[PDB]
Structure 1
Amino acid sequence: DCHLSDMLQQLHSVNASKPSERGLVRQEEAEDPACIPIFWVSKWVDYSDKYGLGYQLCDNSVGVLFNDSTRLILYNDGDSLQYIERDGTESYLTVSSHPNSLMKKITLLKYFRNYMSEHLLKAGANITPREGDELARLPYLRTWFRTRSAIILHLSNGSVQINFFQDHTKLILCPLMAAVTYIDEKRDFRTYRLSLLEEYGCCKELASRLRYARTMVDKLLSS
């Protein structure tokens, strides 16, 4: 990923500046609502022991990255699908066409949609995403993994989202904007330009999560 490499450079640069080591932190100066993401993962379900990783994006679309490395996405109209084969060959179809070869995968996607609707809360439900470019592409989950502390979700638009288990905090990193959105323990959401965190500083909490992010982005790059 060229986006991952860019992301690693941006995280290298903010972390090398040691942004929490400042007499007065002024992280509010680094905020930019123009940079609020269009897409992030709002719900996820790890059924990787049998089927794959089901997820919802903040626009209510649902996707799955299956164990066989294919991906199926159901748009928020409730009928349009995008199917992505193992070589990343994509095609579009509808649920209403009931294609026999995809019936199992559609059934699994509907299972995740139902589970998520009944049993999970929507991350960032208090946030209105920025106005997208009208022709922006809905991303899919490119890769993910879990560590003891977090789940790391790499979207096909280059975004990397890290969800921390212990405190429910989350980072959404966007390399095109060179921005980070941090959702804290109390669900307050702020979006910052990474370069401006270098200049103005940030709290030790964000600084530490940004160190952790760099290591996660290195893991993404090596695998």
Structure 2
Amino acid sequence: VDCHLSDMLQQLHSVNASKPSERGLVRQEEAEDPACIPIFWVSKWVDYSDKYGLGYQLCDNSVGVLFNDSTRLILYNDGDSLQYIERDGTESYLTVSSHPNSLMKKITLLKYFRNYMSEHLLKAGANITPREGDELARLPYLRTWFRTRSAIILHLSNGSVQINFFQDHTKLILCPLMAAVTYIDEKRDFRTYRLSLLEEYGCCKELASRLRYARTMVDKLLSS
């Protein structure tokens, strides 16, 4: 979403311009707003882009794939419902039991992705409990993604941008609708902040340096 990435870029420019870590007093706790906790994030992923594409699991246990041919296939958490997004954005809804002939391969590959992730990878944010009515939210798909030497950047179709850092396992989940960011630290503790309140109360250098990196990555998302 070009308009959501633009708002997030402005939001990041603002907070980074205030230099939130260069302050005598930092009251990062006052910038917290638990009401902004995200509904969806990426909890697992596998880069098979050499052959098939990028497989991933969302925190609601749904699974999706962004194939190299720029189509997408989402298996809802019931294990049967399916959504297929062509290169044109042409959405379609089917079921695994329908056993479509034109999707046999992609369906099989998605199951392989699902099986590997379930049997070999940890669920990020497993300690985050779901609020009532989160089941009604529309399920997003992975619009675009890329990896640097230090992180993977995942842009969801609801406007959210997620950045997972490889070495220390810290993660950012940015929500331009709330002008908010959720940070998962090395100890796996979750905290959600209003970006505008970080400008006004400050934060530690760990989070500030990652918000500087995030802005750079949002510019890269907007380039292509």
Q: What is the TM-score of this pair, normalised by structure 1?
A: 0.98
What is the CA deviation profile of residues 85-127 of structure 1, one whole-angstrom value per residue up to 9, with x for unaligned ones? 0000001000000001000000011001000000000000011
**Percentage of matched positions with identical amino acids:** 100
Deviation of 1:136 (Å)? 2.5
The list of structure 1 runs, each at least 4 consecutive aligned residues, that deviate by more than 2 angstroms after superposition, is: 129-136
Does the Cα contact within 8 Å between 1:36 and 1:129 map onto a contact in 2?
A: no
The equivalent residue for 1:212 is 213
Task: Give the aligned length.
Answer: 223
Does the Cα contact within 8 Å between 2:74 and 2:84 map onto a contact in 1?
A: yes
Separation in 1, partners of 2:12, 2:56: 26
Deviation of 1:170 (Å)? 0.3
Q: Give the 3 Å change call, closer, same or farther, for CA 130–202 of structure 1 in structure 2.
A: farther
RMSD: 1.0
The equivalent residue for 1:70 is 71
Deviation of 1:130 (Å)? 4.4
The SS at the match of 1:166 is coil
The equivalent residue for 1:52 is 53
Does the Cα contact within 8 Å between 2:7 and 2:176 map onto a contact in 1?
A: yes
Does the Cα contact within 8 Å between 1:39 and 1:129 map onto a contact in 2?
A: no
Deviation of 1:209 (Å)? 0.1
Deviation of 1:145 (Å)? 0.1
Separation in 1, partners of 2:73, 2:93: 10
The SS at the match of 2:24 is coil
Separation in 1, partners of 2:36, 2:61: 21
Separation in 2, partners of 1:106, 1:41: 20
- Range with greater deviation from structure 2 (14-23 or 122-131): 122-131
The SS at the match of 1:45 is strand
Does the Cα contact within 8 Å between 1:35 and 1:130 map onto a contact in 2?
A: no
Separation in 2, partners of 1:185, 1:118: 23
What is the CA deviation profile of residues 143-178 of structure 1, one whole-angstrom value per residue up to 9, with x for unaligned ones? 000000000000000000000001000000000011
Q: Give the 3 Å change call, closer, same or farther, for CA 132–29 of structure 1 in structure 2.
A: farther
Separation in 2, partners of 1:124, 1:19: 26
The equivalent residue for 2:176 is 175
Does the Cα contact within 8 Å between 1:30 and 1:197 map onto a contact in 2?
A: yes
Does the Cα contact within 8 Å between 2:30 and 2:197 map onto a contact in 1?
A: yes
Does the Cα contact within 8 Å between 1:37 and 1:129 map onto a contact in 2?
A: no
The SS at the match of 2:193 is strand
